[PDB]
Amino acid sequence: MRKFSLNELAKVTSNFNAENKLGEGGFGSVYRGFLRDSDTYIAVKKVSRASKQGIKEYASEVKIISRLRHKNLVKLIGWCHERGELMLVYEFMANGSLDSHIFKGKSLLTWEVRYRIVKDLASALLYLHEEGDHCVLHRDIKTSNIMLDSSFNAKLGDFGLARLVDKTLLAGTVGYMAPECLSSGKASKESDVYSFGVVALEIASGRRSIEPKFEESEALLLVPWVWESYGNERILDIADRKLGMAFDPKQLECLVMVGLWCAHPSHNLRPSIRQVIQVLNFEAPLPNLPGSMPI
Numbered sequence: 263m264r265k266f267s268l269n270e271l272a273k274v275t276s277n278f279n280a281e282n283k284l285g286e287g288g289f290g291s292v293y294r295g296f297l298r299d300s301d302t303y304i305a306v307k308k309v310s311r312a313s314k315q316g317i318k319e320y321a322s323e324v325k326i327i328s329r330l331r332h333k334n335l336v337k338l339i340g341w342c343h344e345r346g347e348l349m350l351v352y353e354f355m356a357n358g359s360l361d362s363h364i365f366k367g368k369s370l371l372t373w374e375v376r377y378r379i380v381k382d383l384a385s386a387l388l389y390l391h392e393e394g395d396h397c398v399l400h401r402d403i404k405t406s407n408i409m410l411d412s413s414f415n416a417k418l419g420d421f422g423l424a425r426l427v428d429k430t431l432l433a434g435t436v437g438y439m440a441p442e443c444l445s446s447g448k449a450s451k452e453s454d455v456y457s458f459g460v461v462a463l464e465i466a467s468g469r470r471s472i473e474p475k476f477e478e479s480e481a482l483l484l485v486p487w488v489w490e491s492y493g494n495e496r497i498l499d500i501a502d503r504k505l506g507m508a509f510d511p512k513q514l515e516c517l518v519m520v521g522l523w524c525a526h527p528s529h530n531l532r533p534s535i536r537q538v539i540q541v542l543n544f545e546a547p548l549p550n551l552p553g554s555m556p557i
């Protein structure tokens with residue numbers, strides 16, 4: 263990666279023209295930038311200085327992402343810290359973020375691609391939690407933070423809330439936050455695994471955690487409805503309607519039970535991400551879950 267000047271970033275984004283906006287990132291808008299000399303595109307995130315948290319999330323992102331290299335993690339390809347303006351530069355990924363496919367119908371993700379994506383995300387988390395000089399707690403795992411390459415391989419990004427292990431402000435995304443986050447404030451590997459659980463269930467079901475859009479059910483949230491479905495031996499009902507019957511039932515069961523295990527209300531009953539990967543690959547047994555979600 264390298265240092266970009268404000269002027270060159272202005273030039274390649276056409277002064278951050280609205281027609282070049284790709285979407286909203288976690289702490290700024292992202293713009294498509296065109297490199298004339300390479301005939302290639304990049305993605306430029308322009309940081310929002312509208313709270314003080316903008317500069318904190320930029321600083322966290324640079325610090326953390328600089329320490330990470332993995333096939334299932336987004337790579338930083340440059341930065342800019344010049345006058346007041348803070349910016350971050352990444353590869354342009356034409357398939358965009360996972361949420362656009364699974365919730366917004368940009369494409370129909372096949373069962374085989376979805377199961378692969380969950381394994382990709384699990385690999386990323388294993389690397390974060392266990393493979394570095396320091397454990398990295400991500401703190402904002404969700405499908406809008408998962409990028410897709412041309413082959414639909416998944417890369418986890420957004421390190422603006424991420425922290426190295428050896429007091430943080432309570433922060434995160436409502437619908438992905440473990441209950442102990444709100445009661446105690448404490449982030450852990452187990453709180454990251456909770457968010458992974460929620461994501462796994464979103465991917466299986468094509469339903470957003472906070473807005474599942476049930477027509478025949480009164481549940482307002484995804485996880486309780488999945489848990490109730492599992493306890494009534496209705497795992498098949500969980501699967502994204504759009505898939506019809508084109509999915510593997512054994513893998514669906516596995517995905518759902520792993521998701522609930524990860525999303526256990528009690529942090530001490532959640533698996534390690536390494537145990538999750540073993541179960542997803544049928545190298546270790548399915549978890550023993552109660553049929554009712556614990557209160």
Ligand SMILES: CCS(=O)(=O)Nc1ccc2c(c1)/C(=C(/Nc1ccc(CN3CCCCC3)cc1)c1ccccc1)C(=O)N2
Nearest residue numbers: 284285286287288292305352353354355358359407419420
């Ligand atoms: C870690 C998540 S983040 O905070 O956003 N970080 C991030 C980091 C690197 C990135 C992107 C995002 C990104 C996006 N691409 C992108 C976006 C949209 C589209 C879709 N067309 C359709 C035509 C009109 C413009 C948008 C294509 C690529 C994108 C931007 C915002 C929201 C989501 C994706 C990309 O190519 N490289």
Ligand SMILES: [Mg+2]
Nearest residue numbers: 288402420422
């Ligand atoms: Mg975030």
